[PDB]
């Protein structure tokens, strides 16, 4: 029957990296022959029979391509399995990287969509969007060439944690199709929600005694590990660990001072080592002077 062909840790792999192909068949990582592109009736490598795995290390440009395996099946009429699923090894690092931005931005409300736009002044014919992780397939879009720029809009959503995380984009040209560019700078997409929004307020109060110092306090009865304070129109996030200071409240007190800018702030809670999901945002708070 049909083996399962897999690339480990990733079919999208840098030149100079490492990737291992395995052909799981008859409940074992079996012996196998490999096939390229459409030519499933004639093996590559002069019919070399691989034992357990094929290790490409260091990965080279020559390793890129579209592979299928057949598993060894002795004492059967043909001696081999049916063709496996195809695996496309894409080797990265062969062109200058594209740029990658999130529109309207990288903080995405649960249930909403975000555009991840890849673009380049290199006329890439195709773009590939890849979420960081093991065994992840990239999504592909044709490049729209216009005004000396090639670009593609990847649509992500409705947003939830499975779609949050670090993304990179790659370009490819038609003359070397499985040879991808260097990866774009990484872009972190953070989902906000469904965890309940914290409160954001001036503490200990708006009227302050002589020995009292005003802070911007993010607080919740929920057991957040960290809080994130964001100014509207500001790309900088301030982060503080949540502390059990009073009552049953989890809070962080961000100092106000001559160095803090006025404007509109929101804060978010998050949990340790889950950096790509935050709570719903607090109601915005105007900070004066």
């Amino acid at each position: 029957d049909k083996p399962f062909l897999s690339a480990w840790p990733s079919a999208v792999v840098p030149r100079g990296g490492h990737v291992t192909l395995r052909c799981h068949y008859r409940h074992r990582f079996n012996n196998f022959m490999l096939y390229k592109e459409d030519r499933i009736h004639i093996p590559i490598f002069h019919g070399r029979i691989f034992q357990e795995s094929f290790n490409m290390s260091p990965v080279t440009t020559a390793h890129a391509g579209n592979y299928t395996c057949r598993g060894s099946h002795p004492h059967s009429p043909t001696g081999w399995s049916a063709p496996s699923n195809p695996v496309v090894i894409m080797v990265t690092g062969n062109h200058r990287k594209p740029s990658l931005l999130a529109h309207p931005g990288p903080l995405v409300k649960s249930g909403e969509r975000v555009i991840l736009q890849c673009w380049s002044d290199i006329m890439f014919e195709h773009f590939f969007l890849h979420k960081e992780g093991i065994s992840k397939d990239p999504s592909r879009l044709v490049g729209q060439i216009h005004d000396g720029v090639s670009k593609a809009n990847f649509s992500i959503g409705p947003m939830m944690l499975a779609l949050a995380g670090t993304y990179r984009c790659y370009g490819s040209v038609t003359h070397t199709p499985y040879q991808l560019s260097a990866p774009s700078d990484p872009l972190d997409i953070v989902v906000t929600g469904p965890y309940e929004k914290p409160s954001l307020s001036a503490q200990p109060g708006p009227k302050v005694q002589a020995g009292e110092s005003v802070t911007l306090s993010c607080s919740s009865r929920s057991s957040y590990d960290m809080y994130h304070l964001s100014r509207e129109g500001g790309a900088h996030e301030r982060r503080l660990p949540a502390v059990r200071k009073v009552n049953r409240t989890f809070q962080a007190d961000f100092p106000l001072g001559p160095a803090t800018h006025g404007g509109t702030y929101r804060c978010f809670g998050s949990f340790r080592h889950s950096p790509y999901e935050w709570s719903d945002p607090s109601d915005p708070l105007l900070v004066s002077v």
């Binding site: 592109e37 030519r39 004639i42 002069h46 020559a62 004492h75 043909t78 001696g79 038609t174």
Partner: protein, 276 residues
């Protein structure tokens, strides 16, 4: 769906035994379709498969001109190599070039090739990125510097991605009924005593196209690669190919052995055995 076009250039110096010779042959997959030989009476690019014969006069004119210019170029290259390697003007030497394109089922360039040998050893090759070179020795490092300055890789990339792929697509249509129709092997097993106690089982594959084939012997379902004699695939002379694979078997054990064949013309891998 996947196909290749390749040119093979050979240039040979032969002081006192002939003029420096330039030969070019072109192939689509395993089928030769053109030749040029500077030793011919009035050298021109000549057809070698019928499906190229209806290309118009401009095709033959321009490819002949490229080959005539190549004849002069490679005569000079042989002189340059003498200087690089400090060799005598009385000796005979060989320069070879192979280049061309592989296309996938989508008609897009899958791989390009452009590499050179001097006196039978690697000299310089274009890497698979189609933008950098691998030089084999210090002489080829000089050539690499000159070809970088001349932007040779960029020109080759343009040729490979354009002209090469476009004309390969045209040839495949011109000769579709031979180039794109796989002719499966006709297969059989023969038996020949080597002594009073052992015999050769020979598995034959005859009349197949293209030339790529796998032919192996198993004993009790186990591969016998280490004990199998495999001859080089050989041309039958009619644009098909032949191969055989042989194993030496003890008399009385012939039924343990099975021959295994894979070829683009066989929709499933094939198993066969000796039958008296």
């Amino acid at each position: 769906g996947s196909h290749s076009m390749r040119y093979f250039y050979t240039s040979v110096s032969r002081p006192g035994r002939g003029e420096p010779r330039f030969i070019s042959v072109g192939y689509v997959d395993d089928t030769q379709f053109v030749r040029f030989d500077s030793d011919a009476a009035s050298p021109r690019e000549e057809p070698r498969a019928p499906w190229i014969e209806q290309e118009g006069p401009e095709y033959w004119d321009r490819n002949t001109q490229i080959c005539k210019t190549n004849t002069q170029t490679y005569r000079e290259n042989l002189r340059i190599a003498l200087r690089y390697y400090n060799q005598s003007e009385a000796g005979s030497h060989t320069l070879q070039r192979m280049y061309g394109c592989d296309v996938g089922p989508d008609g897009r360039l899958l791989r390009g090739h452009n590499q050179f040998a001097y006196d039978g050893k690697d000299y310089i090759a274009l890497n698979e990125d189609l933008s950098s070179w691998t030089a084999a020795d210090t002489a080829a490092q000089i050539t690499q510097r000159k070809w970088e300055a001349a932007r040779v890789a960029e020109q080759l990339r343009t040729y490979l991605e354009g002209t090469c792929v476009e004309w390969l697509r045209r040839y495949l249509e011109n000769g579709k009924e031979t180039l794109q129709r796989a002719d499966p092997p006709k297969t059989h097993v023969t038996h020949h005593p080597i002594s009073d106690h052992e015999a050769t089982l020979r598995c034959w594959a005859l009349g197949f196209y293209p030339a790529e084939i796998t032919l192996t012997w198993q004993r009790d379902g186990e591969d016998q690669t280490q004990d199998t004699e495999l001859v080089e695939t050989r041309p039958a002379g009619d644009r098909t190919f032949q191969k055989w694979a042989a194993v030496v078997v003890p008399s009385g054990e012939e039924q343990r052995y099975t021959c295994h064949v894979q070829h683009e013309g066989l929709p499933k891998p094939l198993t066969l055995r000796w039958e008296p």
